[PDB]
Structure formats: C-alpha cells, structure tokens
C-alpha cells in the first residue's frame, strides 16, 4: 500500500543496551559469520582461515555438550571471589563490553571447570547406562 | 545450509514439525490432491514466491519458545 515504509533489525547497533535487550537479537549476528594472479591466493587464504575459525568454535562448543542450542545451563557453582555484585545490577546496569573487560583475568579456569564437570557427568552417565 | 537448518532447532533429523500455522492465503487446495497427484518440481514452482516470509516466522517462533521455557526451567 501507500504510506508504510520498511523496518529492519540489523547489525550490532543494539550493542548499547543492558543485558536483557541485547540477548533478544543474538541470532542475526550468529548468521553473519559465513556470508559469501597474486591476489587470488590472498583471498583464498583468508577464506580458509575464516572456515578454520568457525570449525574451531563449533568443536569447542561441542565438547561441553551444550551443542545445538543458543542457551545452556551448567552445574558449576559461582565463586564469589571474582565479582560479588548482585543479580539485578548485573542484568540491568552494565553493557557487554564493560563486563568482558571486567572478567578478562579469570577466563581459563572457568573453561577448565566446565570441561571437568562435563567429563565427570558423561562418564557417570556412561557407566550408569552400562548398568541398565 | 547446515547452519541454516541448525537455527530452526531441528538438527540431526530428516523430519521436524513446528508450531507456525498454515495460512490459506498462499494456496488453499486440500490434502488429498496435494499428497496424491502434485509432483515435487511443480509444487516448488508454484510456491516459489513466499519463502522469505516463511523463514522469519520459524525463526521468531523458536526464539520466543526458547526464551519462554528458559524461565520455566529457571524457576525449577
């Protein structure tokens, strides 16, 4: 008809809000990772690098067992040593970049604990179903 | 296309149902004729206009469903 325009919901422009709003727009960003004589080799190498990075990410997600979904809970408890704060402030005041800058130091130990809990769980489930 | 299938929450399966209702606007017909006589190619040719409209509905339906059930499992 006449009068109605066209509205999008696009790229990272939603990266200046609290935690709650931004999480509503994850999917689009996740979709924009695999879009698509001395110079051809360069672009070919770049494409190969991008594919390798994507596969690395996919495997690293697969190991934890939360594959096939955008959100996933886990059993590791949260040590208060890192940043006490409290839930309401964390979810209604800060932006993503500030949080990332805030939790840059203790990154690897969390991955280690996640991996360990996942492994113990699958082993327990495996012998458990071995009993049945 | 693997990723595109993955987004719609039907990974690892060759068949998958979903909640979006079927509007009669696109093509009324009826079950018997479509599942008996029509072939694949002609069907594709005849529904070649309303693909992009369809994809977004599935996407948003999955997103809303997952967000809703997250709270239910959270209060558990």
């Amino acid at each position: 008809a006449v009068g109605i325009g066209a509205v999008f919901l696009g790229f990272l422009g939603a990266a200046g809000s609290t935690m709650g709003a931004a999480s509503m727009t994850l999917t689009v960003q996740a979709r924009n990772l695999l879009s698509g004589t001395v110079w051809g080799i360069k672009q070919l190498q770049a494409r190969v690098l991008a594919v390798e990075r994507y596969l690395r990410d996919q495997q690293l997600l697969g190991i934890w067992g939360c594959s096939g979904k955008l959100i996933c809970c886990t059993n590791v408890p949260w040590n208060s040593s890192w940043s006490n704060r409290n839930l309401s402030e964390i979810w209604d005041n800060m932006t993503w970049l500030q949080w990332d800058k805030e939790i840059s130091n203790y990154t690897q130990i969390i991955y280690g604990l996640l991996e360990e809990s996942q492994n113990q769980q699958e082993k327990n489930e495996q012998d458990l179903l071995a009993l049945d | 296309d693997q990723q595109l299938l993955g987004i719609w929450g039907c990974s690892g399966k060759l068949i998958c149902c979903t909640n979006v209702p079927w509007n009669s606007s696109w093509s009324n017909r009826n079950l018997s004729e479509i599942w008996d006589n029509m072939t694949w190619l002609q069907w594709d040719k005849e529904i070649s206009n309303y693909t992009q409209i369809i994809y977004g509905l599935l996407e948003e339906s999955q997103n809303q469903q997952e967000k809703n059930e997250q709270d239910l499992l959270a209060l558990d």
């Epitope: 008809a1 009068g3 325009g5 919901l9 790229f11 | -």
Partner: antibody
Framework: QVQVQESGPGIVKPSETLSLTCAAS??????????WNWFRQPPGKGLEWIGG????????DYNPSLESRVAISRDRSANRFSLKLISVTTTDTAVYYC?????????????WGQGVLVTVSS | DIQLTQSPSSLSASVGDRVTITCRAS??????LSWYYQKSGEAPKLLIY???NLQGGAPSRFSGTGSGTEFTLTISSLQPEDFITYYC?????????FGAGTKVDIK
Amino acid sequence: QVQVQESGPGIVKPSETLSLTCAASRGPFSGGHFYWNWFRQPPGKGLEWIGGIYSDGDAADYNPSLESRVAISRDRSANRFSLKLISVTTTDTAVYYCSSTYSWNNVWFDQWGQGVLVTVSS
Amino acid sequence: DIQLTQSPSSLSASVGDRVTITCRASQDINTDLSWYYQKSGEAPKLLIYRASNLQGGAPSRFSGTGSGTEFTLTISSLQPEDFITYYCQQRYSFPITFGAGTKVDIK
C-alpha cells in the same frame, strides 16, 4: 515502541499563524522508514488526514484541500517535526494528533499518543 | 474520492446478542481495508487489518470478511465494552477516506 508528545499554544486569534510540534523516538529497531503523519478531528464528526512526511526526506505531502495553508518541517538534531498553519479559523478548533506506523513484515503496527486540543477564538 | 457507506447508521441490541455491521465501498478496492475501534475519551486503536488478519490481543468473538465493494464485521456475543464506535477505512492510493461510523446502544 515509541512515545510521542505534542507542544503548541492554547489559544490563537483568528487569521494568525499556528505552530505545533511533536517529538518521537526510534525504539529497538536499528534502521528503517517511519512515515510520520499528522491527523486531526473536529468535535462531533469524522476524522480527517492532514499530512505526512518520511523520516529520511523532506518532500512533505499534503491533502489536496489544504495544500496552500500547511507547511511541515522536520529537525534531525532535535528528532522532532513541526507544522505551520496560516489563516486560522474557528473551524480548525479540534483535537490534533501526531502518529507513526511501523513497517514490520506483515503486521502494520500503529501508535497514536495522546493528542492535544486547539481552540480559535477572539 | 472513494466513498464508504456504513450500515446500520445506528443500532441498539441487548448484551450477548449476535450483530453484524457492513461497509460498502464506492468502487472496487480489492482487500486493502481495515477497521479501527475507538471509544469516548481515547484515541483510536486498530481492530482488524485486511479483514482477514486478526490483530493481536483482540477477543476472538469479532470476525471480519468481505471483498470487492462490500465488507462485513460480525460479533457473535455482545459485551458491555463492545458498545463502542467503529470506522472502516481504506489503505489505498491517495487520498485517504474514513467511514461515517456506527454506535451500538443497550436495549
């Protein structure tokens, strides 16, 4: 999700110039077109469309009857839009509204705010 | 300008009744038509779009149909709030027109 408010004088003498203004927001959406519209309704009769303008252009479109007595402007710094009306008369005494209509895929939303009264008297 | 005629101009029935209103266009407008509902002391809010796309949040008792130069709205059961003003209008090329409107009353 957008709120809208109106701003203008309460009483203006006949034949003077009436200036009205209305603000707007962009909501969670990132980029698109918001066809802003100005509507009116006199008491005790049907509504009537005054005019429209895109949020990314300046070719303000007016109804054929009141082409000569309407001017529409937009301000990007203030993200506002204003209307000027000349040769005011007692008939213009009415409730006026600024509205926007989204353009999402096959939904056709619409907001209407609250509007404001305008009275012409001596 | 495309002229739209509403019928009945006024009506009065009891609560819980089934009623029907009609809006006739002066010419063929296809299906780019929508009805807005409004009450005293409030700005209008859209009721139905295209006469075949139910607006979210509306009660299901309202149904809309029609085509060409004739469109119809049927209410299965009256409610105290249903006694309100309605306006059929056309979202077509310029200009833009709106109906006279109909008021439902208690009897």
